[PDB]
Amino acid sequence: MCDRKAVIKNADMSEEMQQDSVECATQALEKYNIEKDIAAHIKKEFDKKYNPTWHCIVGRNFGSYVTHETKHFIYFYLGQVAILLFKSG
Amino acid sequence: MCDRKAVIKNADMSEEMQQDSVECATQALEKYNIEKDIAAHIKKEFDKKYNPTWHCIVGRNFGSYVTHETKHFIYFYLGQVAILLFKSG
């Protein structure tokens, strides 16, 4: 029943990209179910389609800092784990 | 007020850079003592000196994937917390 869950926190990117990342991240969990792998899937998938360089972070206790051009930044919690994604160039 | 062990694992940058990051990271703890804050101050300093863009992450429980130019990557544990630093350009 659940679909396109994940809560937004640092929205800053095209709706399609943010919705695709959320859905794409959800799948990652279903296919791998591991914060580490999640980033790997979403990372290459987007870098390949939308073009690099997408940075990704996932876990449940970690401080992060990075730089990125406007209209390319998204963050949202899901599956009891925080997920981050955003291209740079 | 500078010396610090810190173990290296993903060495991929000039010795001086990694040494400066490790030492600079130590100061960060004593000056801030926070994963996020430490990564913030250190990141900016390196970007200003070596030139952007440096990505930094710190904690002790998080999976992640990111891209970066050759010779621009470093990882090492310290202060009971995993430290990450790496620029791209």
């Binding site: 449940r60 992060s64 730089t67 990125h68 009891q80 | -």
Partner: peptide, 18 residues
């Protein structure tokens, strides 16, 4: 470029364990 900043540390230990 805008610098992203965060600090995750949810105590979602519950029955299981983080």
């Amino acid at each position: 470029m805008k610098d992203t900043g965060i600090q995750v540390d949810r105590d979602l230990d519950g029955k299981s364990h983080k």
